[PDB]
Design a binder for this molecule. Structure first.
Ligand SMILES: COc1cc2nc(NC3CCN(Cc4ccc(C(N)=O)cc4)CC3)nc(Oc3c(C)cc(C#N)cc3C)c2cc1OC
Ligand SMILES: [Mg+2]
Lengths: 556, 414
């Protein structure tokens, strides 16, 4: 008998104030009872469970099920109630590594640690809460009572405690063997290295010895599945990586659930498949909750789906990370607030790809969306590679310089260079800083009756030009914008505009190039056509002539 | 320091559960090296999965130093920690600190590592050193001693800090010493020649009574801190546009000052005139402008600091590296207004300038009132949260919100 070190016990408590579960045991057939007695008898000799006395007041129901071909009976302890009362744990398995951040490994071995799972002991002060009862034959003897000594399958804290226990054990081996890597996921251990194949297993044998130090039986994974590895939906080839086989189903009556899984495949495929668009397909989900409702596809959604099918006609693969090479990210505008990007180190060899869709809002411009895309790629790159990539952007250096130096918000994008890939991001209009000499001055104003929704909008200029238009089904804010629109329509290439509308000021000073409001889009179209526009604001009802004159004309 | 102080959370509040944000490789490496030594020195210890709490952590390089400093974002833990009345309620904030000729700030946060932390509260200080690409589980630690940046650390250590300062305080009864978090604000009116040495007299005292970043001092001059009243232009010829902007500026100022009148200036804007046309001022408008100009000379009426209410700081980007800011508790009742220019290290980086402005404004707020303000930042949330940690150099972190609609008030502090 060789002594084995004891695995350190994680202390576990219940939620404050809550007590253990007290769920009644269901009635079971005579054959299910007989089957559970044989299963628990074997596990008792293995040390997984132990018989207890009648003083334990806690209970968890047991079940017996069978599978398709394996004419066997298997247990099931419904720990649903105990999990509700168990404390929260630190789940160290939230994030999954992305293949684009991994480095090439010559040799990779997979070990099975499922048998090592049952060597992790459960906190002795907590085992009482895991009690369960096997009903007796004909209910004529006291039921056999058991409690768990190891981490039970289905218990809330089993994955966190098992993974943390393995990490603590593997910690000195990895620190003293820097030429290898050890990754843990479920009941598998993945060990990779760039050593030649003869020496690689020498490290593996030393790992089996180090694990035997705690009495952990770790043989090779039974039925060694050949590359690629089917891990977290990826295909990890020795030299490259990709996504498991995407297959967009062919259908003619798409429902809520179909498009929900459709955007799920397209989002999951956009990591490596460049140019994926999901805007028109996702906006059909906006406000539907019944997953069985059928919605006709818009012609711009079928075109977007058909474009996705041609992108998905051939499998696309990605390369692994090389720390010696630079990290480069390139973005392209796709329209309708859609953006696509590729991250690579050498040209034509993407580490990964991705997309960005604009946020919800009434007004926006391309420069803001490009900026948001840069921030998303930056944060994503910090996760995957721990560094910011160099950006290649479809915006000229002068355009960005004009934007950030004049924009009212603070903004910044990291090291980047212009790449001439149309469509380019540009500034479509630039308001003047000072009043324009020789340009006509338009004093605009609008007003609307809140009761009948009738309104007026128009202007008066320093050359005597005037206009007032009667409006139906409008508001004060809409008439204020309509008045500015009229001044732009009826003026020359250069014009000074004076308004008292703080609402219109806030919209225009945000510099949008596209809006959901058709009226704002018309104003933007007029601003593009102009050479110089100076927009000035004044307080309303303050005796300011021109403003007050047109205020009287629109007040009805 | 042997016996601990009992510390509990606020009623009906669990510990913080804040997600660790991604870190670059150099920051991860720096934190690994820092926490390895701190673990050897007993200041922190590894924790198991039974601790579900977490507080974000990152690394900074404080001003004019080349070595990384561990910085914990205890903002969530601080607002969940009990209000501290250590030995008394609270030391009344020294109103004379803001008036001293020179104030030097010293990082005395290392002195907290000598006092142990209540073993029942240590689990709430849990933090995670993240791994790149989630390849390995994050290294999990908790604090065994009073951590830097925690609200309870200066409170528990106040009993000790008073004794180290009394041999110097009673020697120099004219020097004001104020403590806020990990910083010690030492203000004196003597000239800068031996102020450095007088600050050095503070240093080796702490070395005698006990640091990686104590050797440096942040020099301030609050008596020369500029405040900006509202200014009206002085012109010999006024265009229609000039008068229109003046009327707008005065109308906004009327919400702050009583008696602001624009009647005689508005009558000059009689008719539909071109913006660039010069309008001669009548004597009734020149008099009205003169009366408004003197009203804006006097400070605002009924403006007081309410310690029960939060401080709010608004910042406007003015262009060319110039930034204006206002500090208030209720709108239109500014407690302090100022303006910055020429941010060193960022001529073509707006975020770095804004980050330094936030730190300068917070420093002024600590000196004047003894607490940090809630910031209203003219920046999108995604841009600020992506980059602000790259330029942060202070040991404290204020709260902030984001302004998405362009304010009209920018024109009237320009
Ligand atoms: C710097 O730290 C790390 C770097 C890692 N690099 C990698 N890199 C490589 C990248 C290539 N790929 C395909 C391949 C490569 C050749 C062969 C062959 N034997 O011919 C088979 C498969 C094998 C793995 N994998 C790590 O962990 C794994 C992860 C995250 C998932 C799986 C799966 N399922 C397997 C492993 C080993 C890393 C872990 C690290 O730290 C814990
Ligand atoms: Mg009006």
């Amino acid at each position: 008998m060789v002594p084995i070190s004891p695995i350190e016990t994680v202390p576990v408590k219940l939620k404050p104030g809550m007590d253990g579960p007290k769920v009644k045991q269901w009635p079971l057939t005579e054959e299910k009872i007989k089957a559970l007695v044989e299963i628990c008898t074997e596990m008792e000799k293995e040390g997984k469970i132990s018989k207890i006395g009648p003083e334990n007041p806690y209970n968890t129901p047991v079940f017996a099920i069978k599978k398709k071909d394996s004419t066997k009976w298997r247990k099931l302890v419904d720990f649903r109630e105990l999990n509700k009362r168990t404390q929260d744990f630190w789940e160290v398995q939230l994030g999954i590594p992305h293949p684009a951040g991994l480095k090439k490994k010559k040799s990779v071995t997979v070990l099975d640690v499922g048998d090592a799972y049952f060597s992790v002991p459960l906190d002795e002060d907590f085992r009482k809460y895991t009690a369960f009862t096997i009903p007796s034959i004909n209910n004529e003897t006291p039921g056999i009572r058991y409690q768990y000594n190891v981490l039970p399958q289905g218990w809330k804290g089993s994955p966190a405690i098992f993974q943390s226990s393995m990490t603590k054990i593997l910690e000195p081996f990895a620190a003293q063997n820097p030429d290898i890597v050890i990754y843990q996921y479920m009941d598998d251990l993945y060990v990779g290295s760039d050593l030649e194949i003869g020496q690689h297993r020498t490290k593996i044998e030393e790992l089996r010895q180090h694990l035997l130090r705690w009495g952990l039986t770790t043989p090779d994974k039974k039925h060694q599945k050949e590359p690629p590895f089917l891990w977290m939906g990826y295909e990890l080839h020795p030299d490259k990586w990709t996504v498991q086989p995407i297959v967009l189903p062919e259908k003619d009556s798409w429902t809520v659930n179909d498009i929900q899984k459709l955007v799920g495949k397209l989002n999951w495929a956009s990591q490596i498949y460049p140019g994926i668009k999901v805007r028109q397909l996702s906006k059909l989900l906006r406000g539907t909750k019944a997953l069985t409702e059928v919605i006709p596809l818009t012609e711009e959604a079928e075109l977007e789906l058909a474009e996705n099918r041609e992108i998905l006609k051939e499998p696309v693969h990605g390369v692994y990370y090389d720390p010696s090479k630079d990290l480069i990210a390139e973005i392209q505008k796709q329209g309708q607030g859609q953006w696509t990007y590729q991250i690579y180190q050498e040209p034509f060899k993407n580490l990964k790809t991705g997309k960005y869709a604009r946020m919800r809002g009434a007004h926006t411009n391309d420069v803001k969306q490009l900026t948001e895309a840069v921030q998303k790629i930056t944060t994503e790159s910090i996760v995957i590679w721990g560094k910011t990539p160099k950006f290649k952007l479809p915006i000229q250096k002068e355009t960005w310089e004009t934007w950030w130096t004049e924009y009212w918000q603070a903004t910044w994008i990291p090291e980047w260079e212009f790449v001439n890939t149309p469509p380019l991001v540009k500034l479509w209009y630039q308001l003047e800083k000072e009043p324009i000499v020789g340009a006509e001055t338009f004093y605009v104003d609008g007003a609307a009756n809140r009761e009948t929704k009738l309104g007026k909008a128009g202007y008066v200029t320093n050359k005597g030009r005037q206009k007032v238009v009667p409006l139906t089904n409008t508001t004060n804010q809409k008439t204020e914008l309509q008045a500015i629109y009229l001044a732009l329509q009826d003026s020359g290439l250069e014009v000074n505009i004076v308004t008292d509308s703080q609402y219109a000021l806030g919209i225009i000073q945000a510099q949008p190039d596209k809006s959901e409001s058709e009226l704002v889009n018309q104003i933007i179209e007029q601003l593009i056509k102009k050479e110089k526009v100076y927009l000035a604001w004044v307080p309303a009802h303050k005796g300011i002539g021109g403003n007050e004159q047109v205020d009287k004309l629109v007040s009805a | 320091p042997i016996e601990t102080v009992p510390v509990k959370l606020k009623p009906g509040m669990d510990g913080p559960k804040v997600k660790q944000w991604p870190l670059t490789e150099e920051k991860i490496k720096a934190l690994v090296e820092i926490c390895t030594e701190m673990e050897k020195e007993g200041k922190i210890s590894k924790i198991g999965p039974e601790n579900p709490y977490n507080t974000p952590v990152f690394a900074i390089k404080k001003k004019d130093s080349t070595k990384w400093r561990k910085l914990v974002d205890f903002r969530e833990l601080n607002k969940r920690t009990q209000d501290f009345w250590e030995v008394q309620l609270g030391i009344p904030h020294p109103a004379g600190l803001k008036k001293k000729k020179s104030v030097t700030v010293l990082d005395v946060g290392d002195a907290y590592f000598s006092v142990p932390l209540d073993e029942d509260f240590r689990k709430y200080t849990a933090f995670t050193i993240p791994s790149i690409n989630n390849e390995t589980p994050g290294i999990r630690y908790q604090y065994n001693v009073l951590p830097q940046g925690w609200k309870g650390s200066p409170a528990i250590f106040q009993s000790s800090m008073t004794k180290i300062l009394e041999p110097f305080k009673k020697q120099n009864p004219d020097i004001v010493i104020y403590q806020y978090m990990d910083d010690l604000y030492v203000g004196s009116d003597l000239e800068i020649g031996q102020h450095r040495t007088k600050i050095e007299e503070l240093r080796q005292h702490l070395l005698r009574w006990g640091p990686p970043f104590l050797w440096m001092g942040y020099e301030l001059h609050p008596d020369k801190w500029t405040v900006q009243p509202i200014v009206l232009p002085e012109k010999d010829s006024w265009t229609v546009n000039d008068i229109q902007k003046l009327v707008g500026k005065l109308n906004w100022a009327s919400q702050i000052y009583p008696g602001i009148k624009v009647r005689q200036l508005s009558k000059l804007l009689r008719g539909t005139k071109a913006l660039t046309e010069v309008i001669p001022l009548t004597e009734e408008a020149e008099l009205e402008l003169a009366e408004n100009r003197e009203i804006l000379k006097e400070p605002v009426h009924g403006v007081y600091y309410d310690p029960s209410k939060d401080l709010i700081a608004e910042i406007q980007k003015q262009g060319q590296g110039q930034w204006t800011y206002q500090i208030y508790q209720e709108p239109f009742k500014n407690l302090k207004t100022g303006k910055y220019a020429r941010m060193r290290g960022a001529h073509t980086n707006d975020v770095k300038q804004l980050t330094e402005a936030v730190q300068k404004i917070t420093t002024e707020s600590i000196v004047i009132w003894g607490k940090t303000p809630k910031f209203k930042l003219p920046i999108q949330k995604e841009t600020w949260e992506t980059w602000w940690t790259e330029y942060w150099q202070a040991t404290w972190i204020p709260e902030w919100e984001f302004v998405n609609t362009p304010p009209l008030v920018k024109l009237w502090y320009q």
